[model samples]
Structure formats: C-alpha cells, structure tokens
Target: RLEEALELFEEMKEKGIVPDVVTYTTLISGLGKAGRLEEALELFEEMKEKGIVPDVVTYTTLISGLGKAGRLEEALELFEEMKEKGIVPDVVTYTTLISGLGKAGRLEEALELFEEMKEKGIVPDVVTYTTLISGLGKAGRLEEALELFEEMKEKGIVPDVVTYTTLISGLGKAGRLEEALELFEEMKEKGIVPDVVTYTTLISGLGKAG
Candidate 1:
C-alpha cells in the first residue's frame, strides 16, 4: 500500500502531473507513521521547492513525528517557522508541542505554550489536561498536577479514568494515600469505571504506606 502510494506519487510526476499539498502531506504522514522521518522530511522540502505551500496540517504532521522521535529542537524550529509565516497554531499543534516539551524535561516552555494557547482562546481539551498532568506527575510536581486536574474538572472536561488513575498514581507515590482513596471513590461515583491500573495504583500505594 505504501509502495503504491509512493509509486503513484512518482506516477503523477511521470505524467507531468503536479501533486498538490494534500498529496505531499499524505505521503509525509504515511512515512512518519512508518518511522521513515528523514524520507518524510525530504518530501516536505520537495513541496517547498515545488512552490506548493504547506498548510498547517503538513507542519503539524511533521512536528508530531519529530516530537515522538525526540527531535524537540527540530520540531520547535518548525513551529517557529510556521508562526513566522503567520500560520496560527491550533489545539493539536499546541498539545503536541506541549507533550513533546514536557517529555523532554522542558516543562517551563510547555506551560508557557499552554498559557499562550489559552490567551488565544483555544479551549484546552481533556487530552491536553491529561498529558500535562501526566508529565507533572512523573516529574514529582504533584501539587501543580492536582491543581490542573481540578481546573480541568471545573472547565467541564469529563474526568475520565485515565485522569483519575494518573492523579491517583501521583498522589499515592507522594504518600498522599487519603486523597488518592478519595479520588478513587469520586471516580466511581462520577460513572467512569476504574481499571486494574487504578486498583493496582491504590493497592501499591497502600502497601507502600504500610
């Protein structure tokens, strides 16, 4: 399937047919999922040289790949390049960069971008909250994570099991078993079924305290 897609890409060019942004974007996206990022980037450059303007999705695709591949610096350059061209970042773009920066131990810049997104009126979603909370939790910033957890709830974002489990995991690790157990009850009362991860997190934390 990928082979034919690329071959058709060449087939289009072979017949003197010019591929547009969608064609290049799709190829780059496919290559990215296949972990062929260098080749994927080559297509990006090719699009630029062909005078085919890359839209936001194109940059988002590449940025997401670069982020997952631990190329935060390269991803940031792309982010800046897109912005300098007056391409505003959407929620997906900001969320991707936030998770990427956070995973790289660059929470300051991630939080900075989150605030910038908020100022621009892009409402943060549950995924954004969860990703930020997870990063903060892992980094031992339990207070900040809990603050965000509460804020997301107040913002009316559905508190799913993952959010509860993440907060539960963070709290338990911090020896805050009481709050973690309280969250466990609140999670079930709110109608999201807790999973083994949740049960195990609390149990492990309980035993840690004992």
Candidate 2:
C-alpha cells in the first residue's frame, strides 16, 4: 500500500501537482509505519528540498519509526535536530523515544530521558511510567521498577490496569511472590480490574515459582 501510495506521490509530483505539507507528512508517516525507513528518509529529504517545511508532527512520526526500527542513534539525532530548530519535544515525542530506548536494552538512556522529560516540565503520563516500569522489569531491574511504581503513586499519577499488571508480572518473574501478591491485592483495592494478560502473567509467574 505504501509502495502504491509512493507511486501516486511520484505521479502527483510529475504532473506538477504540488504536495502540501500535510500530504507529505502523511506519506512520510505511512512510509515510516511500514518500516521503510530509507524510503521515508528519501521522501523526507525530498520534501525539504521542495521547500516544504517539515513540522513537529513530521519529525515526530519519522522519529517514532526510527525508534521502532531500533535506530536509536538516528532517532536521538533527529530529536536533537528538531529541538535545535525550536521545535519543543512534547510528551508523546519523549514517550516514543523512551519506549524505543527501553526496547533496545538501553535502560540507562531510557531512565535518563525519563528524568529529562520531568526536569524539562513534560509531565510523565501513565503510559510513560508504564513503559519504563516494563522496561526495567524486562531488564531484571526489579528494584528500579518498584521504585518507579512508588514514584508514580507519590506524584499522583494514577496507575491503570496495564501499570498494575506490568508491575505484578515483573515482581512475579523476579521470584518476589510476596510482593507480587501484595500488588495484586492493592490493585483490586484500588478498583482496577485485571485483564486476561494480567491473569496470564501472574499464573505464569506462579508456575515459575512452583
């Protein structure tokens, strides 16, 4: 579909039908989402060359795709470039990078960016904290994951079902059944219903413990 769309893009350009910023943005974003980073880059450069100024949305979309592709360095460089161009990184932008960094096993960089997001006054939302907690858990940093859970609560950021489940699963996998069960109870007490994945994670943890 992206290829066909790009074909249309080429046809549109050849016919002297100028692609506006939004059209270019959508095409670039579609290419990125398809994991065609090189094609996306080509279109991005082409867009710029045609004197269409790429906005924050354009940059953010490409950065997210780069992150998803595990091109962390390129993502970071583009992020800095956007900032230098006076484009402020919003919460979504920071969240995308954090998630990518986490998945890439760059936990230290993820944590650093987490702090940077806060220090820069971009309030970390439930998704942001959940991503970091899950990352730390997967990295076997149970202590740090728990610490983040506490910090989220202390900061009045309500943990949703996903957050509770991730933490519970993390604790369980870490062989901390006592703490995991405690969190399970706390989650119920807070009236957040556990989903199927939550139950599955806890059961898997239980099996592992046994």
Candidate 3:
C-alpha cells in the first residue's frame, strides 16, 4: 500500500508539488511501519536536506523503527540526538524504547529507563506496564513483574484486557497455573473480558503443564 503511495508521491513531486513536513512525516512513518528502516532513514535525511525540519513525530517514528529492527545503538543515538535538538520525548517515546529494550532481553536497561522516565515526571500508561511485565515474565523475573503489576494498580492505573491477558499468559507459560487461573477469575471480576488469545494462551499453558 505504501509502496504505491510512494509512487504517487513521486508523481506529485513531478507535478511540482513540494512535500510538506506532514507529507514527509507520513511517508517516513509509513516506511518505518513497513519495516523498511533503510528507506525510512533515507527519507529522514531527505526531509532535512529538502529543508524540512524533523519534528518529534518524525524522530519518534524513526526511533521506534530502529528499536523494532534491533538497531539499539542507532535507536539510542537518535534518542539522544532528538533531545539534543530540543525535542523532549513524551511518554510514548519512552514507552517505545523501553519496550524495545525489554523485548530484546536488555531488561536491566529497560528497568533503568522505566525509572528514569518516572523521575522525569513521565507517568507510564498501562501499555508501558504491560510491556515491562511481559518482558520480565519472559525473562523469568516473575516476582518483579508481579510487583510492577501491583505498583501500577497502586498508582491507579487500571489494567485493561491486554494487560490482564499478558500477565495471565506470562504466569501460565511459567507453569504457575494456580496463579494464572486466579488471575483469569480476577480479570473477569474486574470486567476485563478475555479474548480468544487469552483463552488460547491458557490452553497452551495447560498443555505445557500436562
């Protein structure tokens, strides 16, 4: 879809249409989403070369793409660059980087960034908590994951269905069926209905235990 869009973009430019910051931002972000990090980077530089200043959205998109691509060093460099360029990262930015680190098994760095974000007055959302919990769970840091879960609740952040499902999946996969089942009930009690993925996770966990 974006490939076709880029073709149309070229057509527009041929017709003397200069792409604005928003246009470049959208295209760059789309490239990132399509997992074309190299192309995205090219567009990023092109945007600046064309005299368009990269904004927070552009930087965030690139940073997220780098992280998702496991280009951690590049991601961190861009993150630092963004700040140096006077772009203060928002919660989403922090969450994306933390998530990338966590998923990459850089749990220590993820935890440090989590604390740093909080220290900077960035209140983490449920997605952030869920990411951290999922990471910790995958890393066999169940105790820490559970502690963070409780902390999020204490901070009045309500766990949504995804959060509940992630924790349940984590616990289930860890062979803590009793705790997983307890959470399953607790999730329903809290009115966060489980979806098919949750059910599937539970079933898989059951099979593993068996």
Model 3 TM-score, all chains together: 0.66
| Model 2 accuracy (lDDT, Cα) | 0.83
lDDT of 2 by residue, 1-210 (tens): 877887888899899887789888898888777777788898888988887789887898888887777888999999998988898888877988998887778889888989888898998878788888877877777788888889989999888887787778776666778788888899999899998876887788778768
Query: Comparing 1 and 3 by lDDT, which wins?
Result: 1
Residue 145 C-alpha lDDT in model 1: 89
Full-model lDDT for every candidate: 0.85, 0.83, 0.85
Give the per-residue lDDT digits (tens) of candidate 1, residues 25-95.
88988887888888889999999897888888788888988888888899999999999999987888888
Where does candidate 2 have its weakest 10-residue lDDT segment?
166-175
lDDT of 3 by residue, 1-210 (tens): 997989999899999988888888899888877778899899888887887788888898888887777888888999998988888888877888998887788889989989999998989978788888877877777789889999998999878887777788777767788888889998989887798877998888878768
Ranking according to TM-score, highest score first: 1, 2, 3
User: Which parts of model 1 are misplaced by more than 4 Å?
Assistant: 1-5, 8-36, 50-52, 169-177, 191-210
Q: Best candidate, TM-score-wise?
A: 1
The lowest-lDDT stretch of 10 consecutive residues in candidate 3 is 165-174
Error of 3 at 76 (Å): 1.8
Give per-residue lDDT, candidate 1, residue 63: 90
Q: Looking at candidate 2, what is the lDDT of residue 5?
A: 80
lDDT of 1: 0.85
Residue runs of model 3 more than 4 Å from their true location after superposition: 1-37, 47-53, 160-184, 191-210
Clashing pairs in 3: none
On the 0 to 100 scale, the lDDT of residue 69 in model 3 is: 78
